[PDB]
């Protein structure tokens, strides 16, 4: 039998309405639901100024390393990112959010990237799935 | 060195012209091909009832539940849902669904849903990548 | 702790401009990123000769041989393909594809496949996400 402990960042809360979890660890591996810029992107886009997709993207990836770091992680666990876009034009707006997010980091996650037809709000612009476990860092790649 | 274990329910036959396994044990865990409300959704629409996306994601969970028993597992080995919904509308519904089929049960999985553009039959609203592993029970989440 | 290893496959260099890794050895799972028939789709478009879906899946499921041969794997070690298609309609062609490659096995991959909206580059109509261990094989399976 493997543990699984629910991972809580106190900034994603799993709200009542909700039949998911933000992140479970699954032994060494951070399973995490995907990560959007709401409800950043509402504010935002109703005060006139709308998160560009760059923006939307640093806001999803840091989602993703607050969820690492309340499991005791760091952005070296990520293994694999999932990203689906709502315009494929985008694609090089979430290349660029990246190349900064791993600053770091010699070597960067695998990744699939897809325009899909919608996002959960219509404000998004970009969801990412991602993939680490506790136990690697990419940081040191043999 | 793992083995892998090809596993069939009963309720739902694979056919031997199909391109995929609907699950295949690897080690502890339960690989699953995407699931669907087809055929019931072929019969619903013909007799002038289809099913919505509540009942699609009904069947399509009681599929994903239908693999894992057949593997020895529960509905408690579920770390995470890949939802591809084609009316991103639909959202809560499924969720309704998910509470339903989790009823059971403290934690949720990990989840992402995301609108496409289509999915491999035309009656179909929803179709659901199940992610599981034999060796945890989210019932005993930390 | 699990070693990771960045692995590279001579026909698919990893460009220092690309903010991902074509595919990294995590212990015995070959992580593979999305791969697309891009840019023999480009070359073939150019030439009046497009690749259809079939042809696409085939140089998309061989990029992934080249990635697992470059790890010293086989396609027996795939365990799961999700494939994202621009056509629902093509679904019927990734399926003759993967018979085609798969010639030497009964037990397939797992499998998702849903349509996008679209891919990165416009000639393509398929891209597929390749999951694997080296340490398994599904011929292993068949009954």
């Known amino acids: 039998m493997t543990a699984v402990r629910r991972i809580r960042a106190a900034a994603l809360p799993d709200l009542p309405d909700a039949s998911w979890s933000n992140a479970l660890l699954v032994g060494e591996e951070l399973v995490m ?57 985008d694609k090089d707006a979430i290349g660029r959010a990246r190349q900064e997010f791993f600053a770091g980091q010699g070597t960067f996650p695998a990744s699939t990237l897809v325009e899909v037809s919608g996002l959960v709000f219509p404000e998004l612009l970009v969801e990412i799935d991602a993939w680490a476990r506790l136990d690697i860092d990419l940081a040191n790649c043999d």
């Open 33 to 89: 639901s995907g990560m959007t810029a709401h409800p950043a992107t509402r504010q935002a886009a109703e005060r006139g100024a709308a998160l560009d997709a760059h923006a939307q993207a640093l806001v999803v990836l840091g989602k993703v390393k607050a969820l690492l770091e309340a499991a005791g992680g760091h952005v070296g666990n990520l293994y694999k990112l999932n990203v689906y876009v709502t315009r494929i034009a």
